RNA sequence: UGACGGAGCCAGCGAGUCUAACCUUGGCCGAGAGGUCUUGGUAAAAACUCCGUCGU
């Protein structure tokens, strides 16, 4: 995923953190890419396509 | 036989590093290592305190 | 001149003129 | 060129590495055009 | 080599120190090493390219000296060397 | 009993005799394989020679060439910021305490 | 119909698929004749059966070996398998029985793989 | 000849000559770009086959000045051999490539490599349409080095007959001379187009302005289609630019 | 027990209407939203076998 975050160590806090696409796929914030920054892995329960938008719901 | 002379440097200690003959550039390799510490240092604490 | 397997020879296929063949 | 100058090799050569006991050493148009733009498209 | 800064250890200068590592100061003497080491490569054999020497540590390194070097006649820079030389494994011209 | 039949100097640079001619040329900076090549064909230098044997008025044109390769025709391709991030990185840190 | 038998040869993920038939010695691999075969350095290890057995018996078939699989070594050894496999099956089928213990024993007489597949099954210890 | 006369387009071009020389973000434009603003769509696919404008008055380039890069069909042992041999055409090529020797060796960020080395690339028509795939979206995107399509010998091609195989060094060199010396474009469906019409430091004002109006006259001229004779319906106007610098008008209808 | 180039040639897993850049220069249309084109920079089978060259 891309452009949810500006930087590696903004991604450190959420990582963990419940996100969910457009669609209804639940998903994961697993860990965050070295480069290029920002930049992080999520597993979702089923396979997501390009055009969904994920989503974390904060408060 | 040819003969040549040994290069060495006095009061050698293995800790301290390679005196560098260019000063900017050893004053930028202690910056570069002490920001690689200190995101190594935060990014470790960022994740246990997310724990 | 045409290609029928590739069309795109007879545009854009460069103009070749006396000047030219005559060597420098 | 001239023998003196080979005189002076040959003596050179003579003369010619720690030895013995020694040791080792120490140490305005355009701007017109870009507000022309600029103003067209702010106007609209 | 020990470190202090890291330096050879000595049977006078560092007397105090080898007694708590426990080894005796006897077996404390890289001069020796420094004699032989003068003596040898400053021998014709050596100016005449038919002599090579290797140092066995006590504590089992094993150091290959090339003909060409000229140590130092001093024993203070000898020491230095070594210390180099122990540490970086290697010295270079 | 009678029949009559090592190093030099060119665009500033030691020249092995030995080597032939275009990769012993080859050693002088800026100059490729397929340069030097070009240059003693230019210079009309047979490429089977070596270095040694050329004579002078071979040499001369070897450097007229290298000097002038636009006269002769030669193809033309022939011829603080840390701080700041440490800085942040500390304003980071502090605050996160 | 012509006269004709079949075999495989096999080595780690090489198959040799040979076609033996009555013919005049026209012997292929992959369409192209054995000479070609490649690599150069161990053409003759396809060529032991051919000179082991004799020219003569294969101067009657024809032999069209297609493969697929493998690297070159292990090709090489399905080619060789395939073709002493073909050859004592032709022989066994058309020709007498004599003959055909003739070549198997000069076969398991030289190397025994140009029979049996060698495989190098796990066996734990 | 109208476009040449009128000192708009002097005038606009001085002030870009001057602004390229004072401004730093400019020092690496060098190439005059016009941009065309035909009145109708042209209506023709971009097929990226470069489409040869010729400039009759003054010569852009000259082939020795420029890296050129030589595309041709597998197996290259024959091209290469007699385009190596033969004296006119011996170093007129920088590098010559197979296609499939050009896919297996450069890939990824070695294909910027080779944008940046060669400053023209020219390929046998017959393997042009493939080059997309193997150069990558960098040489197809903007027009500097999009690839030349040319032909390696005068045979034609008949159906259900075998082209013969040959290379004609002299005809080949032939199209190159053309090509460098002369100018190209690439049709869209689109209003707008841009033609190269200068190099800054090496062509004069008038011999700018002079090339304008070739453009012009071959694009426009009915009598060349289909090379030429795109812009139907006349032009709204014409700019002039460099890569980074912006649109200077110079005519308006 | 090299480099460059060319030539020959050999696998097995893998099939979701699903698979994949960024930052710019400008033209035109559109009330707007935006659409289209143009433009420069940045990122992104092998071993093997044969032949030719250099040379440690």
Redesign the pocket.
């Known amino acids: 995923i891309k452009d949810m975050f500006s930087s590696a160590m903004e991604v450190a806090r959420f990582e963990g953190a419940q996100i969910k696409t457009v669609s209804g796929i639940r998903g994961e914030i697993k860990r965050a890419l070295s480069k290029p920054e920002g930049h992080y892995r999520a597993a979702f329960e ?2 997501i ?3 969904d938008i994920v989503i974390l719901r904060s408060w | 036989i040819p003969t040549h002379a040994p290069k060495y440097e006095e009061n050698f200690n293995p800790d301290k590093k390679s005196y560098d003959p260019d000063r900017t550039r050893s004053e930028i390799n202690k910056m570069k290592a002490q920001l690689k510490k200190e995101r190594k240092f935060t990014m470790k604490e960022i994740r246990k305190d997310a724990k | 001149v045409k290609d029928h397997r590739y069309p795109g020879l007879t545009p854009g296929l460069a103009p070749v003129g006396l000047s030219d063949e005559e060597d420098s | 060129r001239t023998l003196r100058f080979y005189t002076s090799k040959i003596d050179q050569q003579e003369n010619k590495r720690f030895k013995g006991d020694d040791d080792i050493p120490y140490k305005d148009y355009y701007q017109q055009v ?1 507000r022309g ?1 600029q103003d067209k498209k702010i106007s ?1 | 080599t020990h470190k202090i800064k890291y330096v050879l250890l000595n049977c006078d200068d560092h007397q105090g120190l080898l007694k708590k590592m426990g080894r005796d100061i006897s077996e404390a003497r890289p001069d020796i090493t420094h004699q032989c080491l003068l003596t040898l490569l400053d021998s014709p054999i050596n100016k005449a390219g038919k002599l090579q020497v290797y140092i066995q540590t006590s504590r089992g390194i094993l150091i290959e000296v090339n003909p060409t070097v000229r140590i130092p006649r001093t024993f203070k820079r000898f020491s230095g060397l070594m210390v180099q030389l122990l540490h970086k494994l290697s010295i270079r011209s | 009993s009678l029949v009559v039949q090592h190093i030099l100097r060119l665009l500033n640079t030691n020249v092995d005799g030995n ?2 001619i275009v ?2 040329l080859t050693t002088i900076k800026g100059v490729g ?1 397929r340069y030097s090549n070009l240059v003693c064909k230019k210079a009309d230098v047979d490429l089977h020679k070596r270095a040694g044997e050329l004579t002078q008025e071979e040499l001369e044109r070897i450097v007229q060439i290298m000097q002038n390769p636009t006269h002769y025709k030669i193809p033309a391709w022939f011829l603080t910021l840390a701080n700041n991030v440490e800085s942040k990185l500390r304003d980071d840190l502090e605050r996160l305490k | 119909a012509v006269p004709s038998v079949q075999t495989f040869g096999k080595k780690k ?2 198959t040799a698929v040979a076609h033996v038939k009555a013919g005049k010695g026209l012997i292929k691999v ?1 369409g192209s004749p054995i000479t070609l075969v ?4 161990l053409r003759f290890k396809v060529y032991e059966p051919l000179l082991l057995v004799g020219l003569d018996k294969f101067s009657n078939i024809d032999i069209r070996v297609r ?6 070594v ?2 090489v050894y399905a080619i060789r398998q395939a073709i002493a496999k073909g050859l004592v099956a032709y022989h066994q089928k058309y020709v007498d029985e004599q003959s055909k213990n003739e070549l198997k024993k000069a076969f398991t007489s030289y190397d025994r793989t140009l029979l049996i597949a060698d495989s190098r099954r796990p066996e734990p210890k | 000849n109208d476009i040449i006369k009128s000192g708009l387009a002097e005038k606009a071009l001085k002030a870009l000559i001057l602004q390229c020389e004072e401004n730093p973000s400019l020092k ?2 060098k ?1 005059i ?1 016009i ?1 065309i ?1 035909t009145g109708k769509k042209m209506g023709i696919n ?1 097929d990226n086959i470069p489409r040869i404008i010729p400039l009759t008055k003054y010569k852009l380039f000259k082939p020795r000045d420029l890296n050129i890069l030589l595309i041709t069909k ?4 024959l091209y ?1 051999e007699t385009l190596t041999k033969d004296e006119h055409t011996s170093e007129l090529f920088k590098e010559i ?2 296609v ?2 050009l896919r ?2 450069f890939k ?2 070695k ?2 490599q080779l ?2 080395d060669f400053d023209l690339v020219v390929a046998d028509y017959r393997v042009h349409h493939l080059l997309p795939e193997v150069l ?3 040489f197809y ?4 080095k999009l690839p030349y399509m040319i032909r390696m010998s005068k045979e034609v091609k008949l159906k259900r007959q075998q082209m013969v195989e040959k290379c004609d060094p002299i005809y080949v060199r032939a199209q190159l001379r053309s090509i460098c010396k002369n100018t190209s474009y ?1 049709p ?7 033609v190269r019409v200068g190099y800054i430091q090496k062509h004069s004002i008038p011999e700018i302005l002079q090339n304008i109006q070739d453009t012009i006259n071959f694009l426009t001229d009915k009598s060349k289609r289909p090379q030429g004779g795109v812009i139907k319906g006349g032009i ?2 014409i ?1 002039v ?1 460099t ?5 200077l008008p110079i005519y308006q209808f």
């Open positions: 089923d396979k396509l390009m055009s | 870009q733009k609209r | 080597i032939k990769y012993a394989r | 993920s090489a992959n490649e690599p150069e350095i493969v697929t699989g493998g690297g070159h292990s090709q | 690496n434009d190439d770009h941009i603003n971009r597998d197996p290259s042992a290469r490539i197979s499939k020797n297996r060796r990824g960020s294909l910027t944008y940046k990558g979206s960098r995107h903007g027009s500097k690439i869209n469906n689109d209003n707008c187009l841009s709204i106007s700019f630019k890569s980074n610098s912006t649109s």
